[PDB]
Amino acid sequence: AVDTAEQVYISSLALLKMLKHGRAGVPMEVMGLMLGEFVDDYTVRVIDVFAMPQSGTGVSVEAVDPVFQAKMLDMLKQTGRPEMVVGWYHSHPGFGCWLSGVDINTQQSFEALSERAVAVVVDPIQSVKGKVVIDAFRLINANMMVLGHEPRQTTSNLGHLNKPSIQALIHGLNRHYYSITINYRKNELEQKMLLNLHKKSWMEGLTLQDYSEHCKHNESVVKEMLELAKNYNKAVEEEDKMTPEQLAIKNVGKQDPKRHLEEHVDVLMTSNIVQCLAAMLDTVVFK
Amino acid sequence: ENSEKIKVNKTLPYLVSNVIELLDVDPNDQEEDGANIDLDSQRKGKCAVIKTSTRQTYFLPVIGLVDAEKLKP
Amino acid sequence: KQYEKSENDLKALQSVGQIVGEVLKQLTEEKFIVKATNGPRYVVGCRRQLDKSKLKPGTRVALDMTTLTIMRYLPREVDPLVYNMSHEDPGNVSYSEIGGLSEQIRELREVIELPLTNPELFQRVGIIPPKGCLLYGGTGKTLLARAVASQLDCNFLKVVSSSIVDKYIGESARLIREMFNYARDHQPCIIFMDEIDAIGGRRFSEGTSADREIQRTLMELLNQMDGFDTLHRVKMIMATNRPDTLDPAL
Amino acid sequence: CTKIINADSEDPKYIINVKQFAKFVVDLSDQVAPTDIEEGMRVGVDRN
Amino acid sequence: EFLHAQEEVKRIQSIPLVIGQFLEAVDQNTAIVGSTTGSNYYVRILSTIDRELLNASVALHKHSNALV
Amino acid sequence: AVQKVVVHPLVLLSVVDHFNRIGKVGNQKRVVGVLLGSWQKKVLDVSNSFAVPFDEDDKDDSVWFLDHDYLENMYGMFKKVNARERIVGWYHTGPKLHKNDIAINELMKRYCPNSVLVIIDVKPKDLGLPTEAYISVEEVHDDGTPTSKTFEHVTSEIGAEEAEEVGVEHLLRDIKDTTVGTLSQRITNQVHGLKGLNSKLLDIRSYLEKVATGKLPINHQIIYQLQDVFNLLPDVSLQEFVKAFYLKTNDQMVVVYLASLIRSVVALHNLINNKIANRDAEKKEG
Amino acid sequence: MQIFVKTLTGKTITLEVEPSDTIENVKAKIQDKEGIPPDQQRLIFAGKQLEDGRTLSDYNIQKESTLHLVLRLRGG
Amino acid sequence: MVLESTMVCVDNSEYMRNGDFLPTRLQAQQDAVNIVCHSKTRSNPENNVGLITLANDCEVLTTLTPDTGRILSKLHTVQPKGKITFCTGIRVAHLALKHRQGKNHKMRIIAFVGSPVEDNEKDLVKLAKRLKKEKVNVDIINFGEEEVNTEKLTAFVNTLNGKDGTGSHLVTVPPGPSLADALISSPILAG
Amino acid sequence: LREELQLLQEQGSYVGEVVRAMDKKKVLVKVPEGKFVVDVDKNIDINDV
Numbered sequence A: 001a002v003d004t005a006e007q008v009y010i011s012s013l014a015l016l017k018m019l020k021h022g023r024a025g026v027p028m029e030v031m032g033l034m035l036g037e038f039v040d041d042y043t044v045r046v047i048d049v050f051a052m053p054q055s056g057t058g059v060s061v062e063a064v065d066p067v068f069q070a071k072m073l074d075m076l077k078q079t080g081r082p083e084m085v086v087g088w089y090h091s092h093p094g095f096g097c098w099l100s101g102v103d104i105n106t107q108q109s110f111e112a113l114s115e116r117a118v119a120v121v122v123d124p125i126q127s128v129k130g131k132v133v134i135d136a137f138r139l140i141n142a143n144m145m146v147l148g149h150e151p152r153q154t155t156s157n158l159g160h161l162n163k164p165s166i167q168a169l170i171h172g173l174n175r176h177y178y179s180i181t182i183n184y185r186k187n188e189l190e191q192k193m194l195l196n197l198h199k200k201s202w203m204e205g206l207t208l209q210d211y212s213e214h215c216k217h218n219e220s221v222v223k224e225m226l227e228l229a230k231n232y233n234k235a236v237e238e239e240d241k242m243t244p245e246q247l248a249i250k251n252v253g254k255q256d257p258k259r260h261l262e263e264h265v266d267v268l269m270t271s272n273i274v275q276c277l278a279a280m281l282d283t284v285v286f287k
Numbered sequence B: 001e002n003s004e005k006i007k008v009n010k011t012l013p014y015l016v017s018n019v020i021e022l023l024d025v026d027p028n029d030q031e032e033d034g035a036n037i038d039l040d041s042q043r044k045g046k047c048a049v050i051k052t053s054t055r056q057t058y059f060l061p062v063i064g065l066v067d068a069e070k071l072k073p
Numbered sequence C: 001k002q003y004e005k006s007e008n009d010l011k012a013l014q015s016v017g018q019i020v021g022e023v024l025k026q027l028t029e030e031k032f033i034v035k036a037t038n039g040p041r042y043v044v045g046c047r048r049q050l051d052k053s054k055l056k057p058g059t060r061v062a063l064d065m066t067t068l069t070i071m072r073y074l075p076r077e078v079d080p081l082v083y084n085m086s087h088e089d090p091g092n093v094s095y096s097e098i099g100g101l102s103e104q105i106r107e108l109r110e111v112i113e114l115p116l117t118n119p120e121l122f123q124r125v126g127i128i129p130p131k132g133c134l135l136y137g138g139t140g141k142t143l144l145a146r147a148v149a150s151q152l153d154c155n156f157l158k159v160v161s162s163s164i165v166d167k168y169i170g171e172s173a174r175l176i177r178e179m180f181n182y183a184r185d186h187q188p189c190i191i192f193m194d195e196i197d198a199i200g201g202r203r204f205s206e207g208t209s210a211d212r213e214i215q216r217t218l219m220e221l222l223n224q225m226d227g228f229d230t231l232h233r234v235k236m237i238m239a240t241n242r243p244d245t246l247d248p249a250l
Numbered sequence D: 001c002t003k004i005i006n007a008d009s010e011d012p013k014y015i016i017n018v019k020q021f022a023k024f025v026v027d028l029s030d031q032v033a034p035t036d037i038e039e040g041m042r043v044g045v046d047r048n
Numbered sequence E: 001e002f003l004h005a006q007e008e009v010k011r012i013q014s015i016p017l018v019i020g021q022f023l024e025a026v027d028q029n030t031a032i033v034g035s036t037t038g039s040n041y042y043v044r045i046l047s048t049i050d051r052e053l054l055n056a057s058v059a060l061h062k063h064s065n066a067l068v
Numbered sequence F: 001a002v003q004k005v006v007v008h009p010l011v012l013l014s015v016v017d018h019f020n021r022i023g024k025v026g027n028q029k030r031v032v033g034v035l036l037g038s039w040q041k042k043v044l045d046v047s048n049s050f051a052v053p054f055d056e057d058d059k060d061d062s063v064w065f066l067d068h069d070y071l072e073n074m075y076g077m078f079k080k081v082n083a084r085e086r087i088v089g090w091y092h093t094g095p096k097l098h099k100n101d102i103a104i105n106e107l108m109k110r111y112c113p114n115s116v117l118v119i120i121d122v123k124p125k126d127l128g129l130p131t132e133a134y135i136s137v138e139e140v141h142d143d144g145t146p147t148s149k150t151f152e153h154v155t156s157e158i159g160a161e162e163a164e165e166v167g168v169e170h171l172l173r174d175i176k177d178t179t180v181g182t183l184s185q186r187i188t189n190q191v192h193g194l195k196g197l198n199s200k201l202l203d204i205r206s207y208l209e210k211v212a213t214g215k216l217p218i219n220h221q222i223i224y225q226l227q228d229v230f231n232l233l234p235d236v237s238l239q240e241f242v243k244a245f246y247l248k249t250n251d252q253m254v255v256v257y258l259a260s261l262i263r264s265v266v267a268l269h270n271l272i273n274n275k276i277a278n279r280d281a282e283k284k285e286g
Numbered sequence G: 001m002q003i004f005v006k007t008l009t010g011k012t013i014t015l016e017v018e019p020s021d022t023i024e025n026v027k028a029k030i031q032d033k034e035g036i037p038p039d040q041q042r043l044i045f046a047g048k049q050l051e052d053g054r055t056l057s058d059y060n061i062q063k064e065s066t067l068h069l070v071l072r073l074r075g076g
Numbered sequence H: 001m002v003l004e005s006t007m008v009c010v011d012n013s014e015y016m017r018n019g020d021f022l023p024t025r026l027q028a029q030q031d032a033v034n035i036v037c038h039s040k041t042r043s044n045p046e047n048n049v050g051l052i053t054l055a056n057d058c059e060v061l062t063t064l065t066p067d068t069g070r071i072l073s074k075l076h077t078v079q080p081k082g083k084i085t086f087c088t089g090i091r092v093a094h095l096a097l098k099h100r101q102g103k104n105h106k107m108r109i110i111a112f113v114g115s116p117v118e119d120n121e122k123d124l125v126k127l128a129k130r131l132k133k134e135k136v137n138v139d140i141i142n143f144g145e146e147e148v149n150t151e152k153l154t155a156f157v158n159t160l161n162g163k164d165g166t167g168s169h170l171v172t173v174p175p176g177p178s179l180a181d182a183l184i185s186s187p188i189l190a191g
Numbered sequence I: 001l002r003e004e005l006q007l008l009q010e011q012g013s014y015v016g017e018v019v020r021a022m023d024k025k026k027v028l029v030k031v032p033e034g035k036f037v038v039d040v041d042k043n044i045d046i047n048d049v
């Protein structure tokens, strides 16, 4: 049996292949393989990911020639080192994460050879910048659903941590499959070299900024900042009046001075203090 | 078995509708494998458009079982 | 072969019909605000390999059920009503079959057969040809129309002038709209109304109620005929049983 | 409540008509005599 | 961390959103909408809304159908 | 010929994992692979890559191998699984610009006309951008050889994409310098880039190691720029460069003097907004 | 005589058969010895797919020959 | 079957350009390569046959592939012009067989030399003891014309099958333009 | 603010108009949609309705 503390380790490399292939053909359900490295009865490690040419419909998506599969794995053994189809994934476009009535069927084909084929959903729409609604699954027997017997024999307080969505609960969870808690394998091998490689620049700051127009832009804000302060020479004057909780609901048609009047003060500061300081270092450094 | 499965999914409740137009455009250009779909843009025959009394209009890429030459607008 | 037919059915019976849609405008390279003739409208995504540029306001699109995003787009559509209202008379009617109307023959001819080929003489004078005329008078009027129809093979369109009306809210006007649309589709084109009298009507003090949208579509056609469209290679042909009763402006 | 349209011999295949929803190629119930469902008539039909 | 939550707030602000027109509010952070559905419904708002820029062309959530 | 290159963080990452997969050789291996991408609008794009089997023996280091069947079929799969994708050139792991990369580019230019290379970093420490790319130009000229060919660096940056910006910003979850205000410029390029100019002053100090002792080729074409730098060293402080500098300090600070004057009044209006909620509740509530 | 087939996971199995056996026979045999029905029995040898009606003499597949199987992926 | 990988090294040197052998020197050794790649394929279907050269520019002309349609295409107007450089011919032969998909195959190389070589015998004996530490068996077959009694090649084969190697040979060239299908009947019959 | 994302997915309210109410604190109310009757939220007196 299982302990519902399965803890699927994935990587820091596979998920970018997951989302790029998932989003380049997003409204169709694209899918692929999971090529990883098995460990003990509890955990599993999926390290590499590749897709195949597919043929789809609106509600269904199939695969094509199987030759593609064996020839791809031969070339990945000879270059790098050999592995094994950890599992398989697919991509609900903007749905969420569940096993539909056809998604459950090819899972049933894959769980026969190895019983631990991990079924993975990636949604490349719901993922904005933070959360990436992934939620890997695996089947449970509908024979024990007939028995009314509750499976998986909870022997650790690590399963019931993440709560399922109600929309995935409308679907087959939890009558034919279960969820798995996952995290990410992170290391200085990779974590240091995506941070210190992505957002970097070279001259954007040792340079000046359109020197006749920066001082011109120091009037393009201040000119309407007069009349915006005239509204601030207006709105305080109608206080000691109708209970300023009313002055929250009422003022939603037009812009207030008070919040907008500290908005430009930050802008009229950092545009000046940066451009003044960066000019006064080139006097020292350059002769 | 195929005709039997058809009859299975050929249940007795049916949606009435009337013909609007029978579309015939080319397949798109150009298609690739990877995320291919044998359904969308792989030929020129044949498509059409219809409307149930409930005022809906869906695009058919696939004709279905019967032929359409017998049909018309 | 039979089993092949069967599997063509099988593999054919998994596609899904797709929501016919229309686009109002657009916000981003990816944000699109469209609306289906089902009714409502919703923000909707598209495919990154299908000419996100060619989607001008006015285009015709299709949407998937499941996720409601753009998958494919289709060219113009032509409301099969007018289609089957377009090309149904193969009459062998010939000028030989007719007689006693030579002067009328030529009169009609100039205003519908002359400019459709050569415009020179007119600009050489400097006068736009007319747009639409009609006769008035059992004298072979309808028959003569059917006869003259047999001289284009591309661009004759006839309408009975009464089936045009409908029972639903207002789409009768939409009909004439599509008509003039197809007119501008094939710039040489001949639309025809048979006894446009009944639909014609006149002025009233709102006696009835349907008279309201009747006159609505009426003034609709009024506008469509001679307002904000450079009438070019488009003749209207009408006839009556009493050329009194219609609107004076018409 | 439901309205008939027309039928065909040797096979049920009747045509129904309803108020707001569209029409459907339909079938009767065995539990009634197969006859008196001819055209120009009002009949009852389950919701589902 | 507030900023982290404040950026991740937009999970509602996904693509399949219905189109409507705003009508009126009666309180802070909550109001009633109007779409082509005509049927009107009284729903909340989110932080990211500038209350000040509100005959409001508004989009609404597909399933839950709230102000976005 | 080429404006610039655009690199995604995937192909940036898709070399590191292969550098891990051959890291068990221990002794010496450079990662060399096929770079895929689609250059459009005179801007070089880089999308996908893999790595080809490649070995090197130190004695007579002119013997390379590219298993082109592995290059034929896997690109044929990649041309299948993405027909938008094509070859864009190649790359190598690039610590220190190894010698075989003068004819690796000439070995496989029969696929890509402008077969561009990319030098990446596996042990990141710098103050710049640790992705480098060259281009192939050849010359029958100057002084060196009748057959002369030297690589020239076209500028390099890491392009982003709306799909992958979701991924990388979820994959960071680490120490960050967001909330760009008055301080982000102070540390992205005023703390940092001044020390960025260190390793470029010190870089030409490293070529300067040949005054009488270093390597035997002397100058010819290195000093025409160095003669220019002390020539294009900026103007001295005697002219109205003194006077017009005080002029703009006497203009830029006035805007700061107005803006700081506003900052005191706004928070004072906020002060009464707390004295309205202090005194008018102690009698009411208690 | 036996044969050999490897799944994408790297499995290694044999099947004592005779050259007059069809591929469908092997389909059933490893349906009993693997579980997957012949539906998703997409098998490859010599980089080629086999049809289930031809004898083993049609492919010259000898004993303990290194075939390769993948399922017939068709979810959605 | 038996695990090897047959790697042919063709001769596109400039001394092989005349017409002393009857059809062409090029086509006569070509069909000699054609029949041995039918002899290695049909005795073992796992062996692919690709060709390398040992000229001034050691090019991968055709990739190491089991198809010969690229081999049959390139060997017409192959331009056998160039200075021989055999001292790097050991390196372009050995490092090729480390790029193979299997290292459990037997490393078997044939080498066609039909030109006068200017190698150092002191350099190849350092390369031969290199092949002693690399455990490589190469049967060098001499074609064309050369220094008679293959100078430095008897000394290389002896320092190839030394240290319990005892299995490699040196098929020397007869200095007569006869039909070369009978000259290579000794490697195709046995080792 | 870290909870409305698990609050706003809730369906909104319903705008109704009452001609009048009656006993058992129930209310005949309209919607262009037909009328109905349900209870009142205990927090609402009906003389005020």
Ligand SMILES: Nc1ncnc2c1ncn2[C@@H]1O[C@H](COP(=O)(O)OP(=O)(O)OP(O)(O)=S)[C@@H](O)[C@H]1O
Binding pocket: C097, C098, C099, C100, C137, C138, C139, C140, C141, C142, C143, C144, C240, C241
């Ligand atoms: N000038 C004519 N020469 C020969 N036959 C004619 C002539 N005029 C009418 N007919 C015959 O009468 C028929 C009537 O022609 P129509 O064009 O239908 O008449 P009409 O003048 O339009 O009358 P209405 O409007 O239907 S009452 C024709 O089809 C011919 O059979």
Ligand SMILES: [Mg+2]
Binding pocket: C141, C142, C143
């Ligand atoms: Mg008539």
Ligand SMILES: [Zn+2]
Binding pocket: A029, A090, A091, A092, A098, A100, A103, G076
């Ligand atoms: Zn799915």
